[PDB]
Amino acid sequence: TFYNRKDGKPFDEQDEVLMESLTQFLGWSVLNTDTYDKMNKLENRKDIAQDMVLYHVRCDREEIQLILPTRERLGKEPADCEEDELGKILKEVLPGPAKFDIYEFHFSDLECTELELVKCGIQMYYELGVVRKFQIPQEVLVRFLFSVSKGYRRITYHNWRHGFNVAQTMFTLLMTGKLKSYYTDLEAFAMVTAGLCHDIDHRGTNNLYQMKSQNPLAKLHGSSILERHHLEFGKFLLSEETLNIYQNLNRRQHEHVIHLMDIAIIATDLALYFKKRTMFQKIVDESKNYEDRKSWVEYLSLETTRKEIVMAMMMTACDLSAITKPWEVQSKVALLVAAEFWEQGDLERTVLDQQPIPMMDRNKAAELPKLQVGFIDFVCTFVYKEFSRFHEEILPMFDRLQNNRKEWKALADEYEAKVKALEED
Amino acid sequence: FFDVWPVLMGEAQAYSGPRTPDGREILFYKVIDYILHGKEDIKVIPSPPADHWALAS
Amino acid sequence: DIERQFHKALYTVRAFLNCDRYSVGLLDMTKQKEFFDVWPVLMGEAPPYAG
Amino acid sequence: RKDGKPFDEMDETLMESLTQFLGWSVLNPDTYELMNKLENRKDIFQDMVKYHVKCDNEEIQTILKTREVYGKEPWECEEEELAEILQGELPDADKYEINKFHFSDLPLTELELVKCGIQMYYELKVVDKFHIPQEALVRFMYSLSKGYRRITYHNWRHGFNVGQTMFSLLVTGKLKRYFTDLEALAMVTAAFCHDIDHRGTNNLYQMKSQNPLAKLHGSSILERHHLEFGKTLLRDESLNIFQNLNRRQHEHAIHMMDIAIIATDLALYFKKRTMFQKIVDQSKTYETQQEWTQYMMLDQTRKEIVMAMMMTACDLSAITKPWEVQSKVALLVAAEFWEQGDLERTVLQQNPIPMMDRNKADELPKLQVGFIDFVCTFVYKEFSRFHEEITPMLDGITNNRKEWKALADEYETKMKGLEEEK
Numbered sequence: 001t002f003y004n005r006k007d008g009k010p011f012d013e014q015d016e017v018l019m020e021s022l023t024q025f026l027g028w029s030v031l032n033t034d035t036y037d038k039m040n041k042l043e044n045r046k047d048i049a050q051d052m053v054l055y056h057v058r059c060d061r062e063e064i065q066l067i068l069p070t071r072e073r074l075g076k077e078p079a080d081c082e083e084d085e086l087g088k089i090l091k092e093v094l095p096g097p098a099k100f101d102i103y104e105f106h107f108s109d110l111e112c113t114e115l116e117l118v119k120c121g122i123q124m125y126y127e128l129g130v131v132r133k134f135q136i137p138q139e140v141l142v143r144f145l146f147s148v149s150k151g152y153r154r155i156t157y158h159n160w161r162h163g164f165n166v167a168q169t170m171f172t173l174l175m176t177g178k179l180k181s182y183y184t185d186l187e188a189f190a191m192v193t194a195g196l197c198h199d200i201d202h203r204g205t206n207n208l209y210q211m212k213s214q215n216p217l218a219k220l221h222g223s224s225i226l227e228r229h230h231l232e233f234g235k236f237l238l239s240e241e242t243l244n245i246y247q248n249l250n251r252r253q254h255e256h257v258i259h260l261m262d263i264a265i266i267a268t269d270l271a272l273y274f275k276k277r278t279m280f281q282k283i284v285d286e287s288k289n290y291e292d293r294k295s296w297v298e299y300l301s302l303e304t305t306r307k308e309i310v311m312a313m314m315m316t317a318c319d320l321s322a323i324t325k326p327w328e329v330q331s332k333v334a335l336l337v338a339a340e341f342w343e344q345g346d347l348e349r350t351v352l353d354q355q356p357i358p359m360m361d362r363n364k365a366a367e368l369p370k371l372q373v374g375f376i377d378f379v380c381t382f383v384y385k386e387f388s389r390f391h392e393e394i395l396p397m398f399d400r401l402q403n404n405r406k407e408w409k410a411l412a413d414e415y416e417a418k419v420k421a422l423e424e425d
Numbered sequence: 426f427f428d429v430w431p432v433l434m435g436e437a438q439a440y441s442g443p444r445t446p447d448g449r450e451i452l453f454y455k456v457i458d459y460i461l462h463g464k465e466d467i468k469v470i471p472s473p474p475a476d477h478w479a480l481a482s
Numbered sequence: 483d484i485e486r487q488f489h490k491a492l493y494t495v496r497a498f499l500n501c502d503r504y505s506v507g508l509l510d511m512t513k514q515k516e517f518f519d520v521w522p523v524l525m526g527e528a529p530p531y532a533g
Numbered sequence: 534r535k536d537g538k539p540f541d542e543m544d545e546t547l548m549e550s551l552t553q554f555l556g557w558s559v560l561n562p563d564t565y566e567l568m569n570k571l572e573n574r575k576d577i578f579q580d581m582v583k584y585h586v587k588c589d590n591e592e593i594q595t596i597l598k599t600r601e602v603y604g605k606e607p608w609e610c611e612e613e614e615l616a617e618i619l620q621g622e623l624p625d626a627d628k629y630e631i632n633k634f635h636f637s638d639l640p641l642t643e644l645e646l647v648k649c650g651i652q653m654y655y656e657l658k659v660v661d662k663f664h665i666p667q668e669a670l671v672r673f674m675y676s677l678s679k680g681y682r683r684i685t686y687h688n689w690r691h692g693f694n695v696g697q698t699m700f701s702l703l704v705t706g707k708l709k710r711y712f713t714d715l716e717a718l719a720m721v722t723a724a725f726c727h728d729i730d731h732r733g734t735n736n737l738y739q740m741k742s743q744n745p746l747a748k749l750h751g752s753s754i755l756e757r758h759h760l761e762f763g764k765t766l767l768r769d770e771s772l773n774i775f776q777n778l779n780r781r782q783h784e785h786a787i788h789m790m791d792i793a794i795i796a797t798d799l800a801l802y803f804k805k806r807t808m809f810q811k812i813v814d815q816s817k818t819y820e821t822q823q824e825w826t827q828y829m830m831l832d833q834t835r836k837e838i839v840m841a842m843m844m845t846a847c848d849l850s851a852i853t854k855p856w857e858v859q860s861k862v863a864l865l866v867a868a869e870f871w872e873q874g875d876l877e878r879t880v881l882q883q884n885p886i887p888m889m890d891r892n893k894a895d896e897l898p899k900l901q902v903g904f905i906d907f908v909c910t911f912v913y914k915e916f917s918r919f920h921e922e923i924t925p926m927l928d929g930i931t932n933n934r935k936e937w938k939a940l941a942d943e944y945e946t947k948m949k950g951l952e953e954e955k
């Protein structure tokens with residue numbers, strides 16, 4: 001309502017148009033004031049869902065009592081303790097460095113329960129010699145590597161055992177292949193930690209089914225759909241009190257490790273490896289012409305770009321190490337992987353109504369020895385040969401890989417001979 | 426639901442005032458007024474009384 | 483999206499702008515690229531931008 | 534330009550204003566991207582919680598034992614052999630006295646309560662009439678079992694006792710006459726999930742700390758959350774027990790469940806008491822007639838006012854138990870208040886209410902005779918006139934009250950004696 005003009009004259013035709021265009025514009029402008037409320041409700045719903053997720057993947061008061069058995073030796077709860085008091089309890093409960101031989105290349109895990117692996121994992125964080133230097137509180141360490149344990153799903157292959165095996169292989173490379181010389185302690189902390197969270201919430205289907213099924217994952221991200229989902233969940237986990245093992249670091253170191261973790265996690269996508277594989281061979285060749293081993297250290301430990309290309313290759317050399325183990329574990333891991341492949345094939349044929357490809361067809365389960373052979377020639381045989389020419393301590397991996405290839409090819413030949421024999425009549 | 430019960434049980438009376446052409450009830454919950462002679466005196470009212478110098482007419 | 487909004491706001495005012503032809507071009511807003519695209523430059527391939 | 538003459542000032546200002554407006558109007562296309570990212574992130578995080586509160590393929594072999602007897606997976610069986618396989622698993626309604634007012638679940642494991650909740654549906658004769666499947670029912674019960682938290686009081690043990698009491702009212706108190714079978718099913722299945730995913734704090738602590746719950750909803754913050762989560766659970770295939778209902782019946786069941794769940798809030802009970810007190814009194818004027826029967830069950834407002842009172846009498850049923858159970862339950866219910874006191878003392882730096890701080894640990898009995906006098910003595914009185922068969926509950930409270938009173942007086946003397954002589 002407008003109540004009086006200043007000239008003295010009454011309102012007329014022009015004033016109605018002038019004061020009606022304004023109200024038409026302001027009436028049309030309420031779209032933004034509606035969108036505002038819609039966004040303010042979506043945000044709250046997302047926060048509530050995040051909290052409900054967080055509750056189910058943490059350690060309650062009665063769950064950590066299975067690892068550090070306080071409340072019996074002392075009257076106080078884990079939270080009301082002194083740092084040196086908990087060390088005495090932790091020393092006597094954790095397994096020794098030489099009980100489970102975690103310093104070898106042949107460590108098999110299927111002879112231990114799912115609770116032992118957590119204690120071995122937190123032992124590894126003491127072997128590096130990193131808890132004292134940065135002063136990470138010792139309750140947070142246990143709670144974190146128990147939450148990560150409960151974070152994985154429960155499926156055939158991509159479960160907690162794979163996540164522990166990758167980290168163990170990376171630790172073995174760091175402390176037995178002597179690749180520790182090129183990196184400082186801070187750049188190994190964030191590699192061993194980033195080895196435990198590389199497949200943290202795997203559904204059980206590769207990146208192609210995600211695009212062919214219009215999962216909400218395929219619209220949020222555009223390239224390397226799954227590998228970017230494992231990173232934000234991990235950074236959400238280690239971003240809260242009682243699980244933040246990075247709180248005692250200062251600003252620069254925290255920024256450095258957070259920048260160094262995403263490269264390691266995203267580098268596990270096989271497609272990126274094929275494209276940026278040549279650049280590693282040039283570094284390998286440049287290493288040769290130098291005079292001595294020691295001099296090469298002082299050159300490599302300074303250039304930054306060249307170290308990242310080596311880390312992003314150690315991550316792939318670790319992610320598929322299950323092919324280099326003795327022929328008592330490979331014969332089972334192969335079938336474990338085949339199970340997941342057949343399950344994805346069944347889902348493809350049942351839901352979206354297409355024909356699965358020969359790789360994922362449950363019927364033709366007799367040509368498995370053949371396909372595997374091709375895999376060894378297609379992807380594995382390069383990463384390991386290059387690392388063998390780089391350092392000399394990583395040769396057993398290569399010879400065991402050769403032996404496994406021989407075995408698989410022998411089985412494939414036998415199967416093909418039987419098939420040809422059956423067709424004679 | 427807990428507001429339509431008293432009406433259906435004889436506790437209160439149905440509405441009898443004016444209605445907006447799409448059925449809603451007419452009640453103002455804010456009134457912004459400007460004075461531009463002498464003083465700027467901008468004002469906001471959280472709930473207008475029954476007799477404001479604008480709604481009274 | 484931006485492309486539709488400009489193509490609905492410029493089509494309605496043909497008459498008021500008495501001109502024969504007019505055109506609009508849209509730039510790209512990507513400041514910093516990923517890590518796996520910078521590497522080929524810092525290692526001696528694909529010489530840097532010059533424009 | 535279409536006149537043959539060059540551009541000048543008056544054609545610069547016009548096209549400068551046009552481009553200024555177009556430049557300002559780029560706010561809208563960005564919010565489109567922000568919306569289309571927020572929605573997808575919400576969908577991902579809401580699908581992550583459905584894996585943790587659902588019964589997977591294993592751990593359902595602890596009730597339906599199909600592998601050992603048949604050798605095939607549950608989804609391959611028929612409607613028969615499944616009723617047969619679960620016939621011998623479920624308990625018997627007589628041995629455990631499922632439909633009495635004195636049922637106590639202290640010496641029972643959590644797995645048995647699931648198999649009693651499954652039996653309750655068979656007792657009402659609802660499975661066959663509406664053709665609900667079996668696997669869906671069993672998965673639903675086990676999922677509700679896993680959906681509660683592990684806090685001291687509001688756990689699954691409180692979610693079973695508030696459904697058993699309503700079953701007992703609908704079968705032993707003979708309140709089933711007013712309701713059809715569909716409404717009975719809806720009420721029984723909305724009594725189990727009335728307090729689901731309860732954090733452990735009342736509605737004031739949600740407003741003080743500005744939790745995200747306090748912003749999305751405006752009044753009765755926690756009940757709307759319970760309802761929304763329950764309905765989200767009910768809308769998943771392999772967990773949906775409403776697969777074989779037409780649109781009308783499904784809508785009616787959802788509406789009844791909605792009205793039932795939000796009526797268990799104490800702030801809506803103090804204002805809707807006189808209406809019930811009048812509905813009870815007008816029932817006597819149909820004298821010498823047990824055939825009034827809610828005007829032959831044609832009225833609809835009264836059938837929706839009786840249900841709310843039934844829910845708010847089932848919720849507080851713990852006070853009407855024998856003394857040897859109430860004595861143990863009172864400490865559990867006090868522990869949560871004591872725990873909330875510490876959080877609101879430390880996080881907000883505020884002095885707690887005397888019922889919350891541990892320092893009045895000896896003042897517990899006194900408060901327990903205020904509550905009984907204030908909130909939960911009216912309801913069990915009025916029902917006692919509405920029907921007579923639910924009299925044994927009205928006695929219960931009275932007995933309990935007496936005991937509490939005596940205890941309080943003793944404490945008083947202890948406090949009275951020491952102060953005077955000192």
Ligand SMILES: CCCc1nc(C)c2c(=O)nc(-c3cc(S(=O)(=O)N4CCN(CC)CC4)ccc3OCC)[nH]n12
Nearest residue numbers: 206270320322323334335337338359371372374375378
């Ligand atoms: C993504 C699978 C990673 C993997 N880890 C292990 C230990 C194994 C293994 O033993 N065998 C296979 C494996 C790999 C192929 S492949 O060479 O066709 N391969 C090409 C690359 N693409 C990229 C998405 C995948 C398919 C075929 C069959 C395979 O195993 C069948 C059990 N894959 N595999």
Ligand SMILES: CCCc1nc(C)c2c(=O)nc(-c3cc(S(=O)(=O)N4CCN(CC)CC4)ccc3OCC)[nH]n12
Nearest residue numbers: 799800849851852863866867888897900901903904907
């Ligand atoms: C949690 C409240 C509902 C409840 N269920 C049971 C079985 C019990 C019980 O035994 N005792 C109490 C209970 C109730 C009160 S109260 O009367 O002060 N009360 C007023 C209403 N407000 C909410 C609007 C809550 C506080 C005080 C103390 C109580 O228990 C102390 C052990 N409450 N209670």
Ligand SMILES: [Mg+2]
Nearest residue numbers: 198199227268
């Ligand atoms: Mg992966």
Ligand SMILES: [Mg+2]
Nearest residue numbers: 727728755797
């Ligand atoms: Mg409640």
Ligand SMILES: [Zn+2]
Nearest residue numbers: 162198199319
């Ligand atoms: Zn992996």
Ligand SMILES: [Zn+2]
Nearest residue numbers: 695727728848
């Ligand atoms: Zn309750």
